[PDB]
Write a protein that binds this DNA or RNA. Structure first.
Lengths: 79, 92, 99, 205, 89, 91, 78, 100, 92
DNA sequence: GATGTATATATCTGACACGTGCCTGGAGACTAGGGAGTAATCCCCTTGGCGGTTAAAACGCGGGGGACAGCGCGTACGTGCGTTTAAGCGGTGCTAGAGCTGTCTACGACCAATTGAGCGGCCTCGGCACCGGATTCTC
DNA sequence: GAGAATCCGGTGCCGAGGCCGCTCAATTGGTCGTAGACAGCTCTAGCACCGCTTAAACGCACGTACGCGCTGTCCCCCGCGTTTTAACCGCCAAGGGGATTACTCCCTAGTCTCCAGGCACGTGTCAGATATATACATC
């Protein structure tokens, strides 16, 4: 019922430790849950378009790779 | 012998405005605007003729390229206006 | 004996866009209905940005469009600022922005 | 109107072939025949449905009429799905049955969608769109029930969404005038074989 | 304290956000931008979404932490994250 | 005061803030060092084009790098601010 | 010299357009430095086009195309 | 007699010429171009895989894994500017630690 | 029926290294590397067939595209190696 | 000095380097016709310089404005630890959905005549840029 | 409570828009090959779910390491006035090469034909993964 709290209170902590941050503040837990969401829209709205054009109800990996290439953040490892 | 898009921008400006003149320099900007958007859309839709393994550019590919290359409300107005142009083009 | 834009009900040309879209080598086959749609999209974009420019032109008590008016009409609107992000308009200057 | 049902009607008519699309739209009985005369039936399918939606943009729309169109679409494509056979026991107008089933199902969960259609041999085609107590009902994975007033038998369509099967069974048993529901071995593709294997036994008990 | 935790996580390579909550989040956000239609993600593409999201967030928090050491802080406030997006554009 | 009038004045007009001939001699000096021996003709509009691009780039760089001096509580720029502003983008 | 033409009041006006209130002193070197490391990446990316079409003259379209490939699209001067 | 072995290359030449015909790039494609193109691609591939193999060797493993390409790209200076807008799957980051 | 570039990368790796194996995932990265650089150079050189009003792609346009798309020392080594390949291709 | 911190090996586990069959895309051949490379030319756009002015930059100076360093209160954050909840394995079912194989048809390249829509050159005249003048505003 | 900021008016000036000549490129029209929309069938791989189980999150109590406001000190940019200087304007010559045309020729494209290479499939088997157990590094 929470639907964005699957991102947990320590998963953001694991991403901040990978980034190399010593001590997270408080309301970051309410901030990052915004930002990620916005970014996913500017992939998924950009990736549901290509699969709409090829008459396919299946969103393949190549569609997300093309959408990420069009955004500017090129992804290699899949295909 | 070297064409441009000045006359058409001047006609659109005299359509949506009564007497607002435009200088000969700023008109040049409009050339490099609309020799640019045409480079994006009619470039990028060509890419959608390659991912789906086709060889044509119909109206549907240009429609999806406009859905991609523009932000939300402007894209909605553009896709609402373009098919309105096409439907009165078909029944000639 | 009959114009293409007159069937199209538009103002931007149709045969010139079709000529560029064949000679540009974008695809080996060009559908007929495509450049009419594309010219209508270009007409709506130019109409939107000139419609936003003329109001700022009358705001400065002028009737002749200088590039500063186009700079302001791009940067004040939100969605055109989303579109024309990485573009430096020549002779443009910047917005009035303090602190 | 909302901007969700238009995509559903467009997708449903895109699934319809051109061989009997005029038959579907005449049997659906929702638009004027002058507007059938207006629509070109000779261009490609990717604009005929645009013109038909633009007809339905103006006049009337719902989720119920789109659901009834979905029912008429499913009634002519019985080769696609695979059916299941139920039977009730331990125990009549159909209007009270419709009201009882709809009220019991809407009291069971929050969001459901029920649609009926009358067909001969006292048949009723019941489209059910399941949902949760927080989400919209999924229209694209329906559940179809062929129910007969005379026989206690009911034909059941399978779906992706299980876990509502005993809920639907008990709600339809309480919704009918019965107490028991069974689940036989009969799971096949064509409806006429199930019809014969039920009616050869029921008409000649 | 934390210093044994950083040098363990900048060594491994596995995913940090769990697969099923991120899948439910993607299936939530996707159904709003398609006019109420479900889809069927291939089991490969969700990995691509998750890898791009992890790379974007890690680069973002690196740049935000580069901002935090400028102002004398060590703590990463929400003033820092909303400023490292307007600079990048 | 004084600066409060100058920010209002310079953000209104749309002139060229850099003089012509020093910028032209700098561009020619950079162009000599690549593919030596031959000179290179410049059209009179191309140097104006490159000058407009360089002025727009530097104004956007200072306006972007100033936001990391209000953030630290300071008022004044520093070369740390400019180098960090280039570090954020990736140029 | 040929770099001191970008004088102190030139960089000062370039900053005062940008909204900068109070300017330090060392900026007047680093900005000149970054100005050079800008212009080099516009010059050779221009002049390769000039070496392709075998002419000794850099047109304005060459600089517009170099800035096109660089990322900062320039209008007007086309 | 094959055009790969005739020029002394390893990347194919006929496949690159097939992708330059059917790629909608120009109306006519010369013969001296795709051999040059395959040579440049072979040089870039060798340039990556040398550093990747050396970083795999220094970690005492006889197999190349994407963390090794991540280290080889982010430690080299030229490929830092060539691939500066690239995310790599199963990537990880550099061991970045900094204090106040 | 769906081709890739795995065999050739494997041959180059066994050339410049004796026995260094490569996993089946990282090889995929190499595919999306060298289906990408070929998209840049042989894309961008096509643009230089359009500014000079030509219709061919010879070796000279690919040479200038390599001079543009690569940083300094790597571009110098690449342009020094490519003509070395072409000269021993010509005298077949 | 106990807690990490690196190493030996256990084995076990599956990916992967390799061997084979095989379908089809790459090589040989050769005509042919447009692309273009070389040759000449003439103008036109750029380069160099004389000269005089006038804004514009350089340089001392002092003064307030701001950056920096220490510091005390305190509060918001890390950590330790029991619980309880949700995530993963994995296993079953099982069916919607990619795809791909024919077909036939509308449709877009391809081409000869022809003409007006748009491009090049020209000529004002009103819009505008600048210069000087009369009406407000904060220290 | 008066120098500074804003609006206004007059006058030169010069580019913006109207106008004509014209030419070549867009239109019209008839021909033919074929790209792709359309239908139907077939394998497959994604979703739903469930039982378990257990690894991690959750909630909390608490100690304390930074956040932040304050304040003292010292240095350091900005405004100002004077002197100096080079940028610019307009001109004048001249000449290097940019754009145009001709002309042959040659080199790539198309179609046909032949077969060697790169891909899918299948399989033993070594590389490492994780796990336990044991010899060093340290605040």
């Amino acid at each position: 019922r929470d639907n964005i709290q699957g991102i947990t209170k320590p998963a953001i902590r694991r991403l901040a430790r990978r980034g190399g941050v010593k001590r997270i503040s408080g309301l970051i837990y309410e901030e990052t849950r915004g930002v990620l969401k916005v970014f996913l829209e500017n992939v998924i709205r950009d990736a549901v378009t290509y699969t709409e054009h090829a008459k396919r109800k299946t969103v393949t990996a190549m569609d997300v790779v093309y959408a990420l290439k069009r955004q500017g953040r090129t992804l290699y490892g899949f295909g | 012998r070297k064409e441009s898009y000045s006359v058409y921008v001047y006609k659109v400006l005299k359509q949506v405005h009564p007497d607002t003149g435009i200088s000969s320099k700023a008109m040049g900007i409009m050339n490099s605007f609309v020799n640019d958007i045409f480079e994006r859309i009619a470039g990028e839709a060509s890419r959608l003729a390659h991912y789906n393994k086709r060889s044509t550019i119909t109206s549907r590919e240009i429609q999806t390229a406009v859905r991609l290359l523009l932000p939300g409300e402007l894209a909605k107005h553009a896709v609402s206006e373009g098919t309105k142009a096409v439907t009165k083009y078909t029944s000639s | 004996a009959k114009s293409r834009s007159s069937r199209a009900g538009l103002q931007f040309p149709v045969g010139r866009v079709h000529r560029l879209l064949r000679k540009g080598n974008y695809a080996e086959r060009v559908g007929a209905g495509a450049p009419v749609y594309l010219a209508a999209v270009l007409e709506y974009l130019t109409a939107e940005i000139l419609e936003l420019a003329g109001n700022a032109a009358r705001d400065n008590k002028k009737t002749r469009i200088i590039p500063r008016h186009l700079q302001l009409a791009i940067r004040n609107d939100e969605e055109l600022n989303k579109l024309l992000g990485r573009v430096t308009i020549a002779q443009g200057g910047v917005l009035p922005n303090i602190q | 109107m909302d901007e969700t049902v238009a995509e559903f009607i467009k997708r449903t008519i895109l699934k319809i072939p051109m061989n009997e699309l005029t038959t579907i739209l005449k049997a659906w009985d929702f638009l004027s025949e002058n507007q059938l005369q207006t629509v070109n039936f000779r261009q490609r399918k990717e604009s005929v449905v645009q013109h038909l939606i633009h007809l339905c943009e103006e006049k009337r729309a719902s989720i119920s009429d789109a659901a009834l169109l979905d029912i008429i679409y499913m009634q002519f494509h019985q080769h696609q799905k695979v059916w299941d056979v139920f039977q009730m026991s331990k125990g009549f107008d159909m209007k009270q049955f419709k009201n009882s089933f709809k009220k019991i199902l809407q009291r069971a969960l929050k969001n459901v969608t029920v649609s009926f259609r009358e067909t001969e041999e006292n048949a009723v085609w019941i489209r059910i769109a399941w949902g949760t107590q927080y989400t919209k009902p999924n229209q694209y994975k329906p559940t179809y029930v062929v129910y007969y007033s005379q026989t206690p038998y009911a034909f059941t369509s399978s779906s992706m969404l299980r876990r509502n099967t005993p809920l639907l069974g008990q709600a339809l048993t309480i919704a009918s005038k019965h107490h028991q529901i069974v689940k036989m071995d009969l799971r096949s593709r064509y409806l006429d074989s199930l019809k014969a294997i039920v009616f050869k036994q029921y008409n000649q008990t | 304290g934390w210093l044994k935790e950083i040098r363990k996580l900048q060594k491994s390579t596995h995913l940090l956000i769990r697969k099923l909550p991120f899948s439910r989040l993607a299936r939530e956000i996707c159904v709003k931008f398609t006019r109420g239609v479900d889809f069927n993600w291939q089991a490969q593409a969700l990995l691509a979404l998750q890898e791009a999201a992890e790379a974007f967030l890690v680069h973002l928090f690196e740049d935000a932490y580069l901002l935090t050491l400028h102002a004398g802080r060590v703590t990463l406030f929400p003033k820092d994250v909303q400023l490292a997006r307007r600079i990048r554009g």
